Amino acid sequence: AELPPGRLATTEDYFAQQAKQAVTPDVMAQLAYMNYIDFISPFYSRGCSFEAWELKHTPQRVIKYSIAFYAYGLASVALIDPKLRALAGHDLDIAVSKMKCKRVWGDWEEDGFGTDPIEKENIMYKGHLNLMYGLYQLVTGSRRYEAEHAHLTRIIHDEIAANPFAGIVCEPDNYFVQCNSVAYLSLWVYDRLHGTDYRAATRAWLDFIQKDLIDPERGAFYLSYHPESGAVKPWISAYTTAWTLAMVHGMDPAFSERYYPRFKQTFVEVYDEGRKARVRETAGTDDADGGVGLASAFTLLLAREMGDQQLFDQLLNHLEPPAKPSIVSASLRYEHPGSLLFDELLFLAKVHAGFGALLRMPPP
Amino acid sequence: MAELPPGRLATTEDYFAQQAKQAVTPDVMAQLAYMNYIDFISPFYSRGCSFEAWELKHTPQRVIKYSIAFYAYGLASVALIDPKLRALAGHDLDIAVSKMKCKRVWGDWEEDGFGTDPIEKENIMYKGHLNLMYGLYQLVTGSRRYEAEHAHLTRIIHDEIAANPFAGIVCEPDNYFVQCNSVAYLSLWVYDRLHGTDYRAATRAWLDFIQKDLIDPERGAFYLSYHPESGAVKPWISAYTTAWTLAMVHGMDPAFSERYYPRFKQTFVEVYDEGRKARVRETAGTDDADGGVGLASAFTLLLAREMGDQQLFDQLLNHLEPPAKPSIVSASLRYEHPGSLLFDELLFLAKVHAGFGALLRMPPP
Amino acid sequence: AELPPGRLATTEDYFAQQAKQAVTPDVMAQLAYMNYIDFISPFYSRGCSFEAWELKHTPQRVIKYSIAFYAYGLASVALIDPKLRALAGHDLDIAVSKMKCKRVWGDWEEDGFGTDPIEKENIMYKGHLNLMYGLYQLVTGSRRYEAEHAHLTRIIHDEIAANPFAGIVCEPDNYFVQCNSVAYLSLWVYDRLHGTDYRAATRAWLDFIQKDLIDPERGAFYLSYHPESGAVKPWISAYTTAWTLAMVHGMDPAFSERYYPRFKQTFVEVYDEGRKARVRETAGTDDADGGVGLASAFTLLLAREMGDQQLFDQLLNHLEPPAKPSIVSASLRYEHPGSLLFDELLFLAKVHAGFGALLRMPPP
Amino acid sequence: MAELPPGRLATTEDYFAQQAKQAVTPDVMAQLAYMNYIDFISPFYSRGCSFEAWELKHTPQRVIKYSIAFYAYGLASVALIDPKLRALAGHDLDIAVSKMKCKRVWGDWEEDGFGTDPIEKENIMYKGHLNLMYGLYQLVTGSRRYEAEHAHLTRIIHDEIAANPFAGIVCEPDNYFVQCNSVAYLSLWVYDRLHGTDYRAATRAWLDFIQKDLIDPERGAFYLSYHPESGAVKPWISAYTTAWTLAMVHGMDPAFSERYYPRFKQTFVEVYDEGRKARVRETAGTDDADGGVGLASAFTLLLAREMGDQQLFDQLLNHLEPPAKPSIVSASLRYEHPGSLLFDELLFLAKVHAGFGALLRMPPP
Amino acid sequence: AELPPGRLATTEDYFAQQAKQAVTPDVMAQLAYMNYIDFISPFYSRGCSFEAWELKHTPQRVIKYSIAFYAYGLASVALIDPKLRALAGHDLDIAVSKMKCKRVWGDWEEDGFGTDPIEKENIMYKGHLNLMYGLYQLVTGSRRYEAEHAHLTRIIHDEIAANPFAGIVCEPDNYFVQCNSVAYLSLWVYDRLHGTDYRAATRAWLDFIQKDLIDPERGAFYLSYHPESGAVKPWISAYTTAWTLAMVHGMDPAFSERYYPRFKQTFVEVYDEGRKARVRETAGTDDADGGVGLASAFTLLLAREMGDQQLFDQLLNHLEPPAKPSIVSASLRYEHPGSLLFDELLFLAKVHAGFGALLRMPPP
């Protein structure tokens, strides 16, 4: 109802986009940032050109995440406004094209892990890619990437079936729940499109991650698991948990519903007389947004996914005003982005229709 | 028309009278000196694949092709203005073509992953400018030095237009830009003038096409781009896109540009400083001038010239030139604060531009 | 005990970790620095990636020492707290993996000494590697590296047997007692694991180093020995001595016990009314921490090994407060590390359970 | 002539009297110490393909050939001035020729895409200076060390002049410069002096050719360049081009330069500071001095010397030297603030220069 | 015997080292600079590693001179203190090893003169190398390099016999008397060790350099001679003369005794009430230390060679105090070295026992 200080649109306005069949003017300005300027906008062309990311100082290892989060937001744009669905589809085609460039996945080879980023392991990369293939096809109805999608889904399914633990590692011997969450969601999306049952593996996964990987009282996942030693790194992680619960809510909403109030009690600090909120990254600290610095931004996405308007408003009042948004020539820019992936994650949270709603996207 | 405005080098009346006087203004001559004078570092020092002039101005690689082409367009009008500079213009156009073919210029096509050959398909911004340049070189000089290449490229363009389900050719795969097409189509008109052929016949279907989803008739403005694989049109209108397109189209179908020009002005042009100045908004729904690539005002200067709109030309040049702080040192022009990319190139072109139709009708040497 | 100014935990608390079966909170915060943040933490993955060391400006030639000192501390963490044994094992797996990357050992080739860093000489590198292979296996029970450990132990043993002096050189014609000390301890660890007697060569080594290499009155080793000429560089070195006596105390405690009081009288300056201590690197100077700048930090390790709580306290009061530790988001950082290898050596000294206790580590 | 002006090292009378006294001035000697003294970093330390001296002065690569050549030309006059320095001069010329052949010097030809061989065709600025240097080396020394190469290069030059439809040879393809040709032609005169041949006969047709569209005979000034493919001449007159050209031509056809010299002065030379100083505008239609490559005043100093114009020499050197803040430290000369490229080279050359005709007539060793 | 301001030891103390069989403490601190710190000290190892020189910004072309001058000093340390003889030998072994690295001699190839630095010409490089081979063997008694020494001596002898002028050039056509003086001394040393008569060539050389290459009234050599033109660069050079007279004094003491007083009159300025002296590099100037900047430092060496304590004292008072020596952790450093090769040449002059005394060094 009331526009908070430094905000571009109300929480109510974000949540009402889909009912209005229109994105807010600031979301439109973000899409302009994404698409407008020749050569340097991130969605200018399908080529293996990364000038947009160079200009933002994106570290190489983060590029795959930036593209994927953009793609996730774009899928919701398509659902919100039928008149932007073709644009969204176009941008998703670009996203998938760029994602396959060696500048994006080549860390796998440079780090010594292999020359092929798909064949085994590396689930953060190939999970996102497989989700993107599916969202592109849900938005557009095009089979342009279906051959590849059929292949990658099967690699994923086969690697899950072959592993003694439920899921797939990233680097060899590094297991992350948040990266697996994306891979499993990608199976749901393939099943929606094809009528298959690759998603049947999800139960065993949800059982596995609720053992040593979770503190069920705190509603929080541990940082990682390492199959060769059986070790779990003994610190709970807010950003890990927020991202994971958000994606799991589209598969097993009960799971996320169970842990969500505990997660909030463990990590979320409300401040400024109830107007704002910020998220501690681990236990035993008062500091917010430690570690990779993304706890509050992923919690914004979680709040959106769970329909928690009050927490969404508090978090965006913490994140957005200090970053000093402006809209210049109808395009959005932030003078002081507070983290990596800033515009990407604020975009995604502003539009996000729910993973379950994306799974149910009506045909074009 | 005839009082010299603050910070200006010559009056708008003087620019518009160059052809009648058969002489360029002294500042245009000073720009030609910047272009030609100093060993090794002037842009038109030699035909080699050397780009020191552009290194010194910090031209981004992707922009070089545009810089060369806009110089070439201006040089063709110099040839028409002053017969005594026609040979110099021909010389510079020979260099422009030579440099345009260097891999430093076109090599982004390969680096981006689109192909090793920049002519064979797509890439119409590059090859459209190249083809127009081949034609202008030959109109100016009467030389057939590049005719074999011109005959080949013209036919690749024509064939690609015939094979496409939409009217025209893409740049990057799946990126269609009306402005880049406008240059390719004009190149056909120039080939026809020189050869007596009818490649220009394809222009009608193109003008029909762009007046569908690609134009907003209320605003006399083209949308940013079209993307054939999805059928998407990026839903923002673009001033610099429009200005450039209407300017080139006015040499092919003057009525088309005349139809849209008053709308285009109302949509994008802000007159300010009590009527003395004007600046151009790049898109709708903003008060800001010169957003995006930052070239709206400079391409509108070209359009104003093409349309004979002396008042708007004067207003725009009053906005653009004085803050850039021109000076002429040793009879050569420099700007202390160029306001955009392609600044000296576009202010040169607008000052000399005789009209695309007049260039098509250039008398033989 | 009282917490001294600028300190994170008391000396009593460090010395009590093993009895409490728990690391202090600041040691845990160091382990979080080591393990927490994606890509940039030193123990993020097994890959040949060194971002953590790039961020700290570690000179190439120091990387091998950094890894090894971390590994030595990790072995003690395994002994302190059974619940961190799996984590420690995991980190040691990473340490061994990284230690084998050419970024770590490649100076050997770049300097012109050979393309293979194991086959001969180069005992600083291969001695640490061999000790690490053993510690990994004591901590984990895993044979992952046993084939390599068997091979390397035999190269070391053979090279010792073939040399006319007791031990092995680093660069050709450069003999250092500290580097040899690590190699010899590696034989003791191999013997613990396998039931062999490679450690029998230790007696002749201890006899040899007590000739021209030691000033027995000062309880101090000379800098180096150079077999081709028979020269010994005629300056005594505190860091050399402190490291060597520390490792030797796990093999022949009497040897170190004999020299330790003399070493202290030779090099250690107590100051600030008995609260602090700092160590001179050589004789004939009043300056502390000359040379490689590690005399006080290695003496901290020695004091821990010898059970000298008062000197430990004094040295840590000199070293830690000016480096301005803080714990941010439950992870330790120093604003002003006073030397190379700073966080590594303060970690190691805080947790070190004694080289003899590591040799005796009970099975998992 | 004989009061020492402010900031000067020696009087004009003293420079002009060197040859009559058989002794260089102390500042010239200090320059020769700069050139020869310090291990590794002096420019004439050794024959090797090392360029530290030029690295320390920030000489651009493309300028190195010119620096070596101008040193060589000054060294030839040193040999004539003082017999007791003739052997040193010869030694330095041996080094100059050696260095001139190093790829760091001529490699721009290949990097710019014009060929792997810098001698075979075109590239007359390089190979003209090289050919003149071979000749001066041999006049100074009597040595045939480079005679086989000199006979070859002289013939390549002669053949290329005979095969061209215009009189002379280009630098980069299609770039004709009169100053670069003047050096090539003078090289033929030197070869003829040494061998008794008549390659210099081609000079008459050259002097006729450069007096057509390449000259403004009323202003006594040459245009910047000629471009044989188009026939264009770049329409700006150039002071440095003219001063250099007239200086070299005065050793071949003294009447040619005597004709144009007063006109050249009126066109370009500004006397200032109550008659004590002079500075040279690079082109017409400006008040600015030393624009362009920044060498008009320094080449005019050389011309004044060649023409025996002591007053103008004095005025120019009063403009050039004092602000550059010479000092002599440990009997070696340095400038704190050289005012242009090639500064110490051109001031050296102008201080010693005995006249190109006199170099042609150098007595045997 | 009074210690002058800013000096580390008295002139009397330097000159008395050999009688006391001990180096002064500051010379010992220089030897610590040279030998102490891992990796970065110049005499750390025999490898082709040049960190020490990188840290002092030594130009590539100067490295060969630095190593040689260190080696010359080291030979006198051997003679001063029998207890440092083994160390000196060790360092000389390193010096020879380094001298052979392409980083040291590779300018010869980069300049276009050839791929082999000893086959012909290049007498500055190969003269120093040959002298070094001989000093190494005098100090140590070792034949480690004898095969190479026998070959190089014979290449030098053959080249002298084949030339129409007495000696050998450096770069083609560049003849320097100082570079020849080192080659000729190398033949004396070979003869001492082997009983041969390669030194018989010396007489014709001493005759030759006293023609157009010397101004006998001024006691000064010209800069260089250029056989192809017969030119002599017409400026006399103090550093050239000082270095040449110093080495010749070990072969024909009368030659240097003849010219020495003239050399001083020509180039040496006594100042500061007789306390200091500084050397002009050429005639017709008042400025000191022009050109390569080494006139005063090579005159320091000459004064030492000639036994001229007063001039030695005066020069060292000019050179050392402004360079602001300090000894930190028993190792010497200069804050403001006044020239290239500064620590090397002050080291050499402080220890130098006389070239004739080095030729007469007793066996180990």
PDB file of N, CA, C and O in Angstrom, chain B residues 29 32-33 36-40 44-48 50 52 85 87-88 91 145 329-331, chain D residues 62 114 172 174-175 177 224 227 229-230 232 234-238 240 282-283 286 288 291:
ATOM      1  N   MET B  29      37.359  21.649 -43.457  1.00  0.00           N
ATOM      2  CA  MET B  29      38.769  21.487 -43.916  1.00  0.00           C
ATOM      3  C   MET B  29      39.692  21.085 -42.780  1.00  0.00           C
ATOM      4  O   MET B  29      40.519  20.181 -42.953  1.00  0.00           O
ATOM      5  N   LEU B  32      39.227  17.435 -42.092  1.00  0.00           N
ATOM      6  CA  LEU B  32      39.894  16.654 -43.150  1.00  0.00           C
ATOM      7  C   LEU B  32      41.418  16.627 -42.814  1.00  0.00           C
ATOM      8  O   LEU B  32      42.079  15.643 -43.089  1.00  0.00           O
ATOM      9  N   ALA B  33      41.957  17.740 -42.282  1.00  0.00           N
ATOM     10  CA  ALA B  33      43.364  17.746 -41.833  1.00  0.00           C
ATOM     11  C   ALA B  33      43.603  16.811 -40.687  1.00  0.00           C
ATOM     12  O   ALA B  33      44.545  16.017 -40.748  1.00  0.00           O
ATOM     13  N   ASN B  36      43.820  13.361 -42.279  1.00  0.00           N
ATOM     14  CA  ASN B  36      44.857  13.061 -43.290  1.00  0.00           C
ATOM     15  C   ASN B  36      46.302  13.485 -42.997  1.00  0.00           C
ATOM     16  O   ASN B  36      47.198  13.073 -43.722  1.00  0.00           O
ATOM     17  N   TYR B  37      46.500  14.422 -42.071  1.00  0.00           N
ATOM     18  CA  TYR B  37      47.728  15.221 -41.996  1.00  0.00           C
ATOM     19  C   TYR B  37      48.944  14.538 -41.366  1.00  0.00           C
ATOM     20  O   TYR B  37      50.021  14.419 -42.023  1.00  0.00           O
ATOM     21  N   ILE B  38      48.807  14.097 -40.128  1.00  0.00           N
ATOM     22  CA  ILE B  38      50.003  13.651 -39.352  1.00  0.00           C
ATOM     23  C   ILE B  38      50.417  12.229 -39.758  1.00  0.00           C
ATOM     24  O   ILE B  38      49.623  11.288 -39.762  1.00  0.00           O
ATOM     25  N   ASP B  39      51.701  12.063 -40.081  1.00  0.00           N
ATOM     26  CA  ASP B  39      52.244  10.731 -40.312  1.00  0.00           C
ATOM     27  C   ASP B  39      51.893   9.696 -39.282  1.00  0.00           C
ATOM     28  O   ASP B  39      51.946   9.954 -38.073  1.00  0.00           O
ATOM     29  N   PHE B  40      51.580   8.482 -39.796  1.00  0.00           N
ATOM     30  CA  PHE B  40      51.301   7.275 -39.060  1.00  0.00           C
ATOM     31  C   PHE B  40      50.039   7.252 -38.206  1.00  0.00           C
ATOM     32  O   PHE B  40      49.396   6.210 -38.118  1.00  0.00           O
ATOM     33  N   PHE B  44      43.611   8.335 -41.992  1.00  0.00           N
ATOM     34  CA  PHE B  44      43.764   8.115 -43.416  1.00  0.00           C
ATOM     35  C   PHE B  44      45.212   8.308 -43.892  1.00  0.00           C
ATOM     36  O   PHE B  44      45.419   8.699 -45.021  1.00  0.00           O
ATOM     37  N   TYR B  45      46.172   7.876 -43.044  1.00  0.00           N
ATOM     38  CA  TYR B  45      47.575   7.912 -43.395  1.00  0.00           C
ATOM     39  C   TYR B  45      47.932   6.909 -44.455  1.00  0.00           C
ATOM     40  O   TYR B  45      48.601   7.257 -45.459  1.00  0.00           O
ATOM     41  N   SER B  46      47.451   5.698 -44.343  1.00  0.00           N
ATOM     42  CA  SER B  46      47.712   4.707 -45.375  1.00  0.00           C
ATOM     43  C   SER B  46      46.683   3.626 -45.459  1.00  0.00           C
ATOM     44  O   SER B  46      45.876   3.402 -44.567  1.00  0.00           O
ATOM     45  N   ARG B  47      46.750   2.911 -46.572  1.00  0.00           N
ATOM     46  CA  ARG B  47      45.908   1.697 -46.799  1.00  0.00           C
ATOM     47  C   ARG B  47      46.213   0.530 -45.888  1.00  0.00           C
ATOM     48  O   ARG B  47      45.478  -0.448 -45.885  1.00  0.00           O
ATOM     49  N   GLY B  48      47.326   0.544 -45.199  1.00  0.00           N
ATOM     50  CA  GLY B  48      47.602  -0.634 -44.318  1.00  0.00           C
ATOM     51  C   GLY B  48      46.554  -1.020 -43.248  1.00  0.00           C
ATOM     52  O   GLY B  48      45.693  -0.190 -42.848  1.00  0.00           O
ATOM     53  N   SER B  50      46.654  -0.754 -40.203  1.00  0.00           N
ATOM     54  CA  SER B  50      47.112  -0.061 -39.023  1.00  0.00           C
ATOM     55  C   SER B  50      46.038   0.797 -38.462  1.00  0.00           C
ATOM     56  O   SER B  50      45.354   1.445 -39.225  1.00  0.00           O
ATOM     57  N   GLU B  52      46.303   3.007 -35.530  1.00  0.00           N
ATOM     58  CA  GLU B  52      46.773   3.957 -34.465  1.00  0.00           C
ATOM     59  C   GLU B  52      45.840   5.083 -34.156  1.00  0.00           C
ATOM     60  O   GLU B  52      45.648   5.447 -33.006  1.00  0.00           O
ATOM     61  N   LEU B  85      38.449  18.910 -54.189  1.00  0.00           N
ATOM     62  CA  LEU B  85      38.728  17.926 -53.149  1.00  0.00           C
ATOM     63  C   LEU B  85      38.243  16.513 -53.580  1.00  0.00           C
ATOM     64  O   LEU B  85      38.357  15.590 -52.780  1.00  0.00           O
ATOM     65  N   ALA B  87      39.493  14.331 -55.702  1.00  0.00           N
ATOM     66  CA  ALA B  87      40.541  13.342 -55.731  1.00  0.00           C
ATOM     67  C   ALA B  87      40.965  12.931 -54.318  1.00  0.00           C
ATOM     68  O   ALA B  87      41.232  11.726 -54.054  1.00  0.00           O
ATOM     69  N   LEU B  88      41.083  13.910 -53.412  1.00  0.00           N
ATOM     70  CA  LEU B  88      41.433  13.608 -52.043  1.00  0.00           C
ATOM     71  C   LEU B  88      40.369  12.711 -51.415  1.00  0.00           C
ATOM     72  O   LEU B  88      40.695  11.716 -50.721  1.00  0.00           O
ATOM     73  N   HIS B  91      40.803   9.182 -52.780  1.00  0.00           N
ATOM     74  CA  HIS B  91      41.941   8.603 -52.030  1.00  0.00           C
ATOM     75  C   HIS B  91      41.573   8.063 -50.628  1.00  0.00           C
ATOM     76  O   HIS B  91      41.910   6.946 -50.256  1.00  0.00           O
ATOM     77  N   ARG B 145      38.612  -0.624 -59.278  1.00  0.00           N
ATOM     78  CA  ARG B 145      39.525  -1.344 -58.447  1.00  0.00           C
ATOM     79  C   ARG B 145      38.811  -2.406 -57.591  1.00  0.00           C
ATOM     80  O   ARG B 145      39.339  -3.476 -57.391  1.00  0.00           O
ATOM     81  N   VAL B 329      43.968  23.796 -34.106  1.00  0.00           N
ATOM     82  CA  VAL B 329      45.363  24.045 -33.696  1.00  0.00           C
ATOM     83  C   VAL B 329      46.140  23.601 -34.929  1.00  0.00           C
ATOM     84  O   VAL B 329      45.948  22.453 -35.411  1.00  0.00           O
ATOM     85  N   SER B 330      46.936  24.489 -35.482  1.00  0.00           N
ATOM     86  CA  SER B 330      47.738  24.169 -36.668  1.00  0.00           C
ATOM     87  C   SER B 330      46.793  23.667 -37.820  1.00  0.00           C
ATOM     88  O   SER B 330      47.103  22.717 -38.493  1.00  0.00           O
ATOM     89  N   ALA B 331      45.643  24.357 -37.961  1.00  0.00           N
ATOM     90  CA  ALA B 331      44.661  24.147 -39.024  1.00  0.00           C
ATOM     91  C   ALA B 331      44.053  22.725 -38.990  1.00  0.00           C
ATOM     92  O   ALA B 331      43.567  22.249 -39.973  1.00  0.00           O
TER      93      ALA B 331
ATOM     94  N   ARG D  62      58.900   3.585 -34.833  1.00  0.00           N
ATOM     95  CA  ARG D  62      58.877   4.052 -36.251  1.00  0.00           C
ATOM     96  C   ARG D  62      59.923   5.183 -36.502  1.00  0.00           C
ATOM     97  O   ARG D  62      60.288   5.456 -37.645  1.00  0.00           O
ATOM     98  N   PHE D 114      53.119  -4.979 -45.153  1.00  0.00           N
ATOM     99  CA  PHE D 114      53.609  -4.573 -46.462  1.00  0.00           C
ATOM    100  C   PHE D 114      54.652  -5.471 -47.079  1.00  0.00           C
ATOM    101  O   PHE D 114      54.918  -5.353 -48.280  1.00  0.00           O
ATOM    102  N   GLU D 172      54.998   3.742 -47.939  1.00  0.00           N
ATOM    103  CA  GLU D 172      53.900   2.733 -47.944  1.00  0.00           C
ATOM    104  C   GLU D 172      53.295   2.733 -49.344  1.00  0.00           C
ATOM    105  O   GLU D 172      53.464   3.680 -50.165  1.00  0.00           O
ATOM    106  N   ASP D 174      51.287   3.371 -52.438  1.00  0.00           N
ATOM    107  CA  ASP D 174      50.504   4.530 -52.767  1.00  0.00           C
ATOM    108  C   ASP D 174      50.701   5.822 -52.002  1.00  0.00           C
ATOM    109  O   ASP D 174      49.852   6.720 -52.112  1.00  0.00           O
ATOM    110  N   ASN D 175      51.746   5.909 -51.195  1.00  0.00           N
ATOM    111  CA  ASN D 175      52.105   7.149 -50.457  1.00  0.00           C
ATOM    112  C   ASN D 175      53.430   7.682 -50.938  1.00  0.00           C
ATOM    113  O   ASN D 175      54.477   7.045 -50.626  1.00  0.00           O
ATOM    114  N   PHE D 177      56.160  10.739 -50.893  1.00  0.00           N
ATOM    115  CA  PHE D 177      56.621  11.929 -50.097  1.00  0.00           C
ATOM    116  C   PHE D 177      57.868  12.517 -50.718  1.00  0.00           C
ATOM    117  O   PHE D 177      58.835  11.756 -50.963  1.00  0.00           O
ATOM    118  N   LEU D 224      51.859  17.976 -48.709  1.00  0.00           N
ATOM    119  CA  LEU D 224      52.200  16.904 -47.834  1.00  0.00           C
ATOM    120  C   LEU D 224      52.591  15.614 -48.529  1.00  0.00           C
ATOM    121  O   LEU D 224      53.539  14.954 -48.119  1.00  0.00           O
ATOM    122  N   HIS D 227      49.636  10.620 -54.268  1.00  0.00           N
ATOM    123  CA  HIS D 227      49.058   9.298 -54.191  1.00  0.00           C
ATOM    124  C   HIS D 227      48.760   8.791 -55.581  1.00  0.00           C
ATOM    125  O   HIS D 227      47.772   9.221 -56.179  1.00  0.00           O
ATOM    126  N   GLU D 229      47.939   6.191 -57.349  1.00  0.00           N
ATOM    127  CA  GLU D 229      46.746   5.485 -57.807  1.00  0.00           C
ATOM    128  C   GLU D 229      45.606   6.440 -58.168  1.00  0.00           C
ATOM    129  O   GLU D 229      44.867   6.207 -59.140  1.00  0.00           O
ATOM    130  N   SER D 230      45.395   7.482 -57.375  1.00  0.00           N
ATOM    131  CA  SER D 230      44.295   8.442 -57.626  1.00  0.00           C
ATOM    132  C   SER D 230      44.797   9.682 -58.352  1.00  0.00           C
ATOM    133  O   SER D 230      43.961  10.495 -58.801  1.00  0.00           O
ATOM    134  N   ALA D 232      45.867  12.061 -56.492  1.00  0.00           N
ATOM    135  CA  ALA D 232      45.585  13.103 -55.503  1.00  0.00           C
ATOM    136  C   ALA D 232      46.872  13.635 -54.917  1.00  0.00           C
ATOM    137  O   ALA D 232      47.793  12.860 -54.609  1.00  0.00           O
ATOM    138  N   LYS D 234      47.527  15.636 -51.211  1.00  0.00           N
ATOM    139  CA  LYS D 234      46.861  16.093 -49.982  1.00  0.00           C
ATOM    140  C   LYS D 234      47.068  17.578 -49.939  1.00  0.00           C
ATOM    141  O   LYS D 234      48.182  18.043 -50.001  1.00  0.00           O
ATOM    142  N   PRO D 235      45.954  18.359 -49.900  1.00  0.00           N
ATOM    143  CA  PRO D 235      45.981  19.754 -50.177  1.00  0.00           C
ATOM    144  C   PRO D 235      46.444  20.639 -49.042  1.00  0.00           C
ATOM    145  O   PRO D 235      45.920  21.719 -48.899  1.00  0.00           O
ATOM    146  N   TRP D 236      47.460  20.277 -48.251  1.00  0.00           N
ATOM    147  CA  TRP D 236      47.989  21.210 -47.255  1.00  0.00           C
ATOM    148  C   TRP D 236      49.482  21.274 -47.548  1.00  0.00           C
ATOM    149  O   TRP D 236      50.123  20.204 -47.765  1.00  0.00           O
ATOM    150  N   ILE D 237      50.018  22.484 -47.536  1.00  0.00           N
ATOM    151  CA  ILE D 237      51.482  22.682 -47.603  1.00  0.00           C
ATOM    152  C   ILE D 237      52.111  22.395 -46.259  1.00  0.00           C
ATOM    153  O   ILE D 237      51.477  22.586 -45.213  1.00  0.00           O
ATOM    154  N   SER D 238      53.356  21.872 -46.284  1.00  0.00           N
ATOM    155  CA  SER D 238      54.058  21.405 -45.066  1.00  0.00           C
ATOM    156  C   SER D 238      55.450  22.013 -44.952  1.00  0.00           C
ATOM    157  O   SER D 238      56.307  21.797 -45.820  1.00  0.00           O
ATOM    158  N   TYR D 240      57.896  21.375 -42.525  1.00  0.00           N
ATOM    159  CA  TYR D 240      58.962  20.421 -42.284  1.00  0.00           C
ATOM    160  C   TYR D 240      59.333  19.609 -43.557  1.00  0.00           C
ATOM    161  O   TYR D 240      60.533  19.431 -43.851  1.00  0.00           O
ATOM    162  N   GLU D 282      53.811  24.981 -39.250  1.00  0.00           N
ATOM    163  CA  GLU D 282      53.872  23.747 -40.079  1.00  0.00           C
ATOM    164  C   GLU D 282      53.058  23.815 -41.353  1.00  0.00           C
ATOM    165  O   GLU D 282      53.372  23.108 -42.319  1.00  0.00           O
ATOM    166  N   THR D 283      51.958  24.573 -41.349  1.00  0.00           N
ATOM    167  CA  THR D 283      51.092  24.684 -42.545  1.00  0.00           C
ATOM    168  C   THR D 283      50.540  26.066 -42.650  1.00  0.00           C
ATOM    169  O   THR D 283      50.810  26.928 -41.810  1.00  0.00           O
ATOM    170  N   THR D 286      47.293  29.166 -40.237  1.00  0.00           N
ATOM    171  CA  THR D 286      47.410  29.058 -38.780  1.00  0.00           C
ATOM    172  C   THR D 286      48.443  30.043 -38.288  1.00  0.00           C
ATOM    173  O   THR D 286      49.313  30.346 -39.036  1.00  0.00           O
ATOM    174  N   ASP D 288      49.793  28.989 -35.270  1.00  0.00           N
ATOM    175  CA  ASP D 288      50.477  28.065 -34.355  1.00  0.00           C
ATOM    176  C   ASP D 288      51.831  27.600 -34.972  1.00  0.00           C
ATOM    177  O   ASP D 288      51.877  27.292 -36.171  1.00  0.00           O
ATOM    178  N   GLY D 291      53.241  22.639 -35.394  1.00  0.00           N
ATOM    179  CA  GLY D 291      52.149  21.657 -35.395  1.00  0.00           C
ATOM    180  C   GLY D 291      52.548  20.403 -36.150  1.00  0.00           C
ATOM    181  O   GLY D 291      53.736  20.171 -36.504  1.00  0.00           O
TER     182      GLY D 291
END
